[PDB]
Design a binder for this molecule. Structure first.
Ligand SMILES: [Cl-]
Ligand SMILES: [Cl-]
Ligand SMILES: [Cl-]
Ligand SMILES: [Cl-]
Ligand SMILES: [Cl-]
Ligand SMILES: [Cl-]
Ligand SMILES: [Cl-]
Ligand SMILES: [Cl-]
Ligand code: NA
Length: 129
């Protein structure tokens, strides 16, 4: 599913991501924009052999199981395929664990490089939330 911007903001809020760990909703929407362009089915292979899955490009090195990432963990206790669903529940629940892991949203390199410090409220501007 390719979400609309406000549609995704609303779904993230529904699932308790707004201000989670102090990160406003616009931070999450901005991260999703640059990770997946709001496409739940996005996948990308990393140089290390791991793969990133879903709207927030969650990595199989630590967070989900895909059966083909040697030496990896599955700390969200989910198949990586769950992160591609039109229903964002699994991605949101896993993102909550990731953002709590110590480095906040810097876990998402694209958030650090493209969202951090910017006017992230622009991403939810105009939305009925
Ligand atoms: Cl957009
Ligand atoms: Cl915001
Ligand atoms: Cl594996
Ligand atoms: Cl393969
Ligand atoms: Cl594990
Ligand atoms: Cl699994
Ligand atoms: Cl949803
Ligand atoms: Cl933080
Ligand atoms: Na894994």
């Amino acid at each position: 599913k390719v979400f609309g911007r406000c549609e995704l903001a609303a779904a993230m809020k529904r699932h308790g991501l707004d201000n989670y760990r102090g990160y406003s909703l616009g931070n999450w929407v901005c991260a999703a924009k640059f990770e997946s362009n709001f496409n739940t089915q996005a996948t990308n292979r990393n140089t290390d052999g791991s793969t990133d899955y879903g709207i927030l490009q969650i990595n199989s090195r630590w967070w989900c199981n895909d059966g083909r990432t040697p030496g990896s963990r599955n700390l969200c206790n989910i198949p990586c395929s769950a992160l591609l669903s039109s229903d964002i529940t699994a991605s949101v629940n896993c993102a909550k664990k990731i953002v709590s892991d110590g480095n906040g949203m810097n876990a998402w390199v694209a958030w650090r490089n493209r969202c951090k410090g910017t006017d992230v409220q622009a991403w939810i501007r105009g939305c009925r939330l």
